[PDB]
Each structure stands twice: as C-alpha cells, then as structure tokens.
Design a protein around this ligand. Structure first.
Ligand SMILES: O=P(O)(O)OC[C@H]1O[C@@H](O)[C@H](O)[C@@H](O)[C@@H]1O
Ligand code: ALF
Ligand SMILES: [Mg+2]
Ligand code: NA
Ligand code: NA
Length: 219
C-alpha cells in the first residue's frame, strides 16, 4: 500500500489554475502579447512564475530588461494575490476534503508538492493546513516542475520514499515531475491535455481513497 499522497494545489485542491491563467493572460496582453489562450496555457500550468513569464515572452520572441522582468512578475503576483483573497473553504474542490480526512484516518501521509509561493496562504484560506503533514518549500528546491525535485522533497518531508507515494496533478509539467520522481501519477483533466499513458480522472470527485488504492494495486 502507498504511504503518502503528494498534492499539487492549483487545479487539484481548488480552481486557482483558472486565476493563474487569467492573471498571466492579462499580463501578457498589457505587454502586447496575445497568444496566451487556454490551449497555450496548458504549457504554463505547473511551471514557476519565472518560467511562466519566460514562456510568454518566448511566444513573441520578446526581450525585456531584467528590471522589467522583475516588475512584470511582481505585477502579475500582486494581481493574483488580490484575486485569491476571498477564497474560502467553499472553494475546495469536490471530494478533496473527504480524501484528506480518509487519508488521515488511515495513517497515510499528506504533503503539498506545489510550485506556488502562495500555497501556504491558500491552504489557510481553505482551512486545510491542519490536514497537511508537510508543505514542500518551492523556493528551496534547486529545480522547479517539470523537474521532480518538489515531489521528491514532499515525500522526504513526510518520511516516505517517492516510490511509496501517489502524486495528484492537473498539468503536463506536473505529471512529468511525478513520473521522474518515482511516485505514481493520477491526473485530473482531459487526456487530450495530460496524455493517455497514465490514469486520468475527469473531475476531483473521482479522487477517493478507494480509487487510489485500486490504481496502486493495478501498478
Ligand atoms: O506564482 P506562484 O504563486 O508562485 O505560482 C507558481 C505556479 O504554481 C503552480 O501551482 C501553478 O500551476 C502555476 O500556474 C504557477 O505559475
Ligand atoms: F498547480 Al501547482 F504546484 F499547485 F503546479
Ligand atoms: Mg496544478
Ligand atoms: Na482560514
Ligand atoms: Na499541518
């Protein structure tokens, strides 16, 4: 049996992937870049703020100064942070609170494997902090998603090997990070976006302890 579950936050615990998208799209358009649509945004999910802005700039082969880059990242974060102030426990995605309670009851470790510097604040907004045994610090890893480091760190923070863990993700980059960590990925979203080579559920209500156990059993 698996010993830990390693959670992505945005798009897994709550619908904040939508808010990252809207904030990055708005930023892109302010600097005259119009290609940040939902399809392109599949390349932005899971990656750090710095990598997100770089991918957007790359889209238009645009070059900005280092000072401008810092200011643009800050502007997007400030906007995003305002957007999320009213997040509450009502915003936790279906099934997720039950899953956390069921994992806890069965002595399965719970760790956050989020790239987001806003992760601790969002878990507080949603009254979820008490369920997490550890939160991996995304500033402390040497390499961000799709590098596996954050998933490895999250497993190690709860005293479990990645190979004894399940990772839950909504992004291409995150799925790759889970694969390379040694943990077992279960994605949420569309196979058109996330692939046909791992288990994908259509919505978070499918993330039940019973389903996770069966996935684990089947390999
Ligand atoms: O800008 P933050 O809050 O540090 O978030 C970093 C990343 O966190 C990930 O969880 C999101 O999927 C990305 O979209 C986001 O860029
Ligand atoms: F959506 Al995440 F780390 F919370 F990639
Ligand atoms: Mg995500
Ligand atoms: Na709270
Ligand atoms: Na906690």
């Amino acid at each position: 049996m698996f010993k830990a579950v390693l959670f992505d936050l945005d798009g897994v615990i709550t619908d904040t992937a939508e808010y990252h998208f809207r904030a990055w799209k708005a930023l892109a358009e302010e600097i005259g870049i119009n290609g940040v649509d939902r399809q392109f945004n599949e390349q932005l999910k899971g990656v750090s703020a710095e990598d997100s802005l770089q991918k957007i700039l790359d889209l238009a082969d645009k070059k900005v100064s280092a000072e401008e880059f810092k200011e643009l990242a800050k502007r997007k974060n400030d906007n995003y942070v305002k957007m999320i102030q009213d997040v509450s426990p009502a915003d936790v995605y279906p099934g997720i609170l039950q899953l956390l309670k069921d994992l806890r009851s069965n002595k399965i470790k719970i760790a956050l494997a989020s790239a987001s510097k806003n992760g601790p604040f969002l878990l507080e907004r949603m009254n979820l902090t008490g369920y997490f045994d550890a939160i991996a610090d995304p500033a402390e890893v040497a390499a961000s998603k799709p590098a596996p480091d954050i998933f490895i760190a999250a497993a190690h923070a709860v005293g479990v090997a990645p190979s004894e863990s399940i990772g839950l993700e909504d992004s291409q980059a995150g799925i790759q990070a889970i694969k390379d960590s040694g943990a077992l990925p279960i994605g949420v979203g569309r196979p058109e976006d996330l692939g046909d080579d791992i288990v994908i559920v259509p919505d978070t209500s499918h993330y039940t302890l019973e389903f996770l156990k069966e996935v684990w059993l089947q390999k």
